[PDB]
Amino acid sequence: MFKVYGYDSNIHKCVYCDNAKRLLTVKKQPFEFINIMPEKGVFDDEKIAELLTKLGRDTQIGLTMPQVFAPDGSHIGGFDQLREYFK
C-alpha cells in the first residue's frame, strides 16, 4: 500500500491524484491516500511533522504534492518519479 501525500477533496486541487490513482490500480497494487489539509485552508500538523522527519533530516525544499511513500520502506516520490518505482 503506497502512501500518497496530497489532497483528496474540494479544499485543494490535485491532477496527479487522478492518474497516480489509476496508475497503481492498473499495475495491480493497493495504496492509501493521505490529506495534508483537513481544513478549508489548514494543513495537518500531525502528518506534516512526521512528513519532514520521514523525508530525512533537512527542510522542505519546495515540497510539492502529491508525495508518495513506500508501503513499508521510504519516500518514493511523486507521479512520474513513482512511475519509475512501478516501471
Swiss-Prot record:
SUPFAM superfamilies: Thioredoxin-like
InterPro entries cross-referenced by the UniProt entry: GLR_AS, Glutaredoxin, Thioredoxin-like_sf
Limits of the Glutaredoxin domain: 1-87
UniProt superkingdom: Viruses
Keywords: Deoxyribonucleotide synthesis, Disulfide bond, Electron transport, NADP, Redox-active center, Transport
SS bonds (residue pairs): C14-C17
GO biological process: deoxyribonucleotide biosynthetic process
Pfam families: Glutaredoxin
Transmembrane segments: none
Protein family per UniProt: Belongs to the glutaredoxin family.
UniProt miscellaneous comment: The disulfide bond functions as an electron carrier in the synthesis of deoxyribonucleotides from the corresponding ribonucleotide.
Role noted for this protein: Serves as a reducing agent for the phage-induced ribonucleotide reductase, but not for the bacterial ones. This specificity may be the result of sequence differences around the redox-active disulfide bond. The oxidized form accepts electrons from bacterial glutathione and will, in turn, reduce other small disulfides. Can also be reduced by NADPH and by bacterial thioredoxin reductase.
Record protein name field: Glutaredoxin
Organism annotation: Enterobacteria phage T4 (Bacteriophage T4)
Lineage, highest ranks first: Viruses, Duplodnaviria, Heunggongvirae, Uroviricota, Caudoviricetes
